[PDB]
């Protein structure tokens, strides 16, 4: 089939335009996942109280800070309490002679009247809308876990649907579903409905990812395939900065969600001009349509060979795969063979480490630094060169050292972030950025490396298993933040430990670079 591609053009105008078109949609797809750093930002909050918040109440000569001290006790963080208020105004606490021994838990009560939120940075957020605070604080990571579980289920459903219906058709309807569900989520009346719509949006996100990746491979020459994969990866790097800019411009969660969702109506529209995979059409016994698609691509590339292509070469050339693909093969086959068992274990561990670490760290930037807009931007700024250098290094120094070093660097940088004093926010932010860049380089390295570790018959099965492992770990990513009750260092300790152990294991893989 590579000869058919050469007759049509293995890397030309068509492939360039297609790659750009898909990269834009990947940028917006990235914005969809990173949105909840801003859409679900936690502002500073406190109980509503009469002396502070009922502006119609009798005025006094006291300043706002004195009223805040009179109304709200100091909390565990050595800062104003976020979930308890004084039952009666503590006038006794106003003099400098007072001491904390003068009041007890009997004087406190939960926020009967609700919470007051800081509006300086964000005009509105999900947390403020549905009071995902205090006793309900766990509901934010639950929502993110539901979104990632939606991705996992969408990936499970995409494969059979893609094979039965086609790459481009499923990509089109995934675009449409993303647009519809993202717009609907912006106007959700209640939190469970928001969760439902986010789940159904992730369901389509999975299809967009998988079919973009698949469709780029099948129209590209084998020699250029890794480079095209790397550019597809750079699409997310651009998505990060796009998220930072749009969130800087749009401080309202509904408008932000709507803005990042609307573009997918345009993606849905131009998906119709993309050609369906010719490999899929030939395999499914539709050579007449495959000829149309192939000569369309040749016309775009400007080749004269449209006068020479005929159904006979189309039918015969791919026939070998049409015959050999009739065997169903399974994940159990990988673990039966003694030699492949070890490679499979380590490869799946590395996939899991990538997914777990990335979606653990990237969705709580608020804990890593002071300014999340700038941090979000710099993640992409560093991700671009990290991914390109990963490509260069793995082509020059090998897959094994590159993957191992990337994972070790990410883990060591994240572990250091817990060790640095909290007051040095700049250094911690830099370490966080470097860790995430290392994670992106590791994603590139594992994507290229996993294809080369397995025999051609079992290649796709092992890669699918690895991807499922990564998407499973992504779910556990957010849940680990609930360990923050015992201190903010513990989640970062886990996030840093996992990549270190998986990177050390990667040193036990064989090298696949040609001599
Ligand atoms: O969600 C994925 C992804 C996961 C798997 Cl397991 C894949 O196979 C593919 Cl193609 C993509 N990414 C790849 S990323 O550049 O790290 C990145 C950065 C930011 C947001 C998402 C994301
Ligand atoms: C605020 O204070 C006024 C004082 O007249 C009172 O009528 C009103 O009910 C109070 N509102 C709340 C929410 O406490």
From Swiss-Prot:
The keyword Mitochondrion does not apply. Electroneutral antiporter that translocates urate across the apical membrane of proximal tubular cells in exchange for monovalent organic or inorganic anions. Involved in renal reabsorption of urate and helps maintaining blood levels of uric acid. Mediates urate uptake by an exchange with organic anions such as (S)-lactate and nicotinate, and inorganic anion Cl(-). Other inorganic anions such as Br(-), I(-) and NO3(-) may also act as counteranions that exchange for urate. GO terms for biological process: cellular homeostasis; cellular response to insulin stimulus; monoatomic ion transport; organic anion transport; renal urate salt excretion; response to xenobiotic stimulus; urate metabolic process; urate transport. GO terms for cellular component: apical plasma membrane; brush border membrane; extracellular exosome; membrane; plasma membrane. PROSITE patterns: MFS. This is Solute carrier family 22 member 12. The gene is SLC22A12. It is linked to Hypouricemia renal 1: A disorder characterized by impaired uric acid reabsorption at the apical membrane of proximal renal tubule cells, and high urinary urate excretion. Patients often appear asymptomatic, but may be subject to exercise-induced acute renal failure, chronic renal dysfunction and nephrolithiasis. It comes from Homo sapiens. The lineage of its organism: Eukaryota, Metazoa, Chordata, Craniata, Vertebrata. GO terms for molecular function: PDZ domain binding; urate transmembrane transporter activity. It is a multi-pass membrane protein. Interacts with PDZK1.
């Amino acid at each position: 089939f590579s000869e058919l591609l050469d007759l049509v053009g293995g890397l030309g105008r068509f492939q360039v335009l297609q790659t750009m078109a898909l990269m834009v949609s990947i940028m917006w797809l990235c914005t969809q996942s990173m949105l909840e750093n801003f859409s679900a930002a936690v502002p500073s909050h406190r109980c509503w109280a009469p002396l502070l918040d009922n502006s119609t109440a009798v005025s006094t000569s006291l300043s706002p800070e004195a009223l805040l001290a009179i109304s709200i006790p100091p909390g565990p963080n050595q800062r104003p309490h976020q979930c308890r208020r004084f039952r009666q105004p503590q006038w006794q606490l106003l003099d400098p002679n007072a001491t904390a021994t003068s009041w007890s838990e009997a004087d406190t009560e939960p926020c009967v009247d609700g919470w007051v939120y800081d509006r300086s940075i964000f005009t509105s957020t999900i947390v403020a809308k549905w009071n995902l605070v205090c006793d309900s604080h766990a509901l934010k990571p639950m929502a993110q876990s539901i979104y990632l579980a939606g991705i996992l289920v969408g990936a499970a459903a995409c494969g059979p649907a893609s094979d039965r219906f086609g790459r481009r058709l499923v990509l089109t309807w995934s675009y449409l579903q993303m647009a519809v569900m993202g717009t609907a989520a912006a106007f959700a009346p209640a939190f469970p409905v928001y969760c439902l719509f986010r789940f159904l949006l992730a369901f389509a996100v999975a299809g967009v990812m998988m079919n973009t990746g698949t469709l780029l491979m099948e129209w590209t020459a084998a020699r250029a395939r890794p480079l095209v994969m790397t550019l597809n990866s750079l699409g997310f790097s651009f998505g990060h900065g796009l998220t930072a800019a749009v969130a800087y411009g749009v401080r309202d969660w509904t408008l932000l969600q709507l803005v990042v969702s609307v573009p997918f109506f345009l993606c849905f529209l131009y998906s119709w001009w993309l050609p369906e995979s010719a490999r899929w059409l030939i395999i499914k016994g539709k050579p007449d349509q495959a000829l149309q698609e192939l000569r369309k691509v040749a016309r775009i590339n400007g080749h004269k060979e449209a006068k020479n292509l005929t159904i006979e070469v189309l039918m015969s050339s791919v026939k070998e795969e049409v015959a050999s693909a009739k065997e169903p093969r399974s994940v159990l086959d990988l673990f039966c063979v003694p030699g492949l068992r070890f490679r499979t274990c380590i490869s799946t561990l590395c996939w899991f480490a990538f997914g777990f670490t990335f979606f653990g760290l990237a969705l709580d930037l608020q804990a890593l630094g002071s300014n999340i807009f700038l941090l979000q931007m710099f993640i992409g700024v560093v991700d671009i060169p990290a991914k390109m250098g990963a490509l260069l290094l793995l082509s020059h120094l090998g897959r094994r050292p590159t993957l191992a070093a990337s994972l070790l660097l990410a883990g060591l940088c994240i572990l250091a972030n817990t060790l640095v004093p909290h007051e040095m926010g700049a250094l911690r932010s830099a370490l966080a950025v470097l860790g995430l860049g290392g994670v992106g380089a590791a994603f590139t390295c594992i994507t290229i490396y996993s294809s080369e570790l397995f025999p051609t018959v079992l290649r796709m099965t092992a890669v699918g298993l690895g991807q499922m492992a990564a998407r499973g770990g992504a779910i556990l990513g957010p849940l680990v933040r609930l360990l923050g009750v015992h201190g903010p260092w513990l989640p970062l300790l886990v996030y840093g430990t996992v990549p270190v152990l998986s990177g050390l294991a990667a040193l036990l893989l064989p090298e696949t670079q040609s001599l």
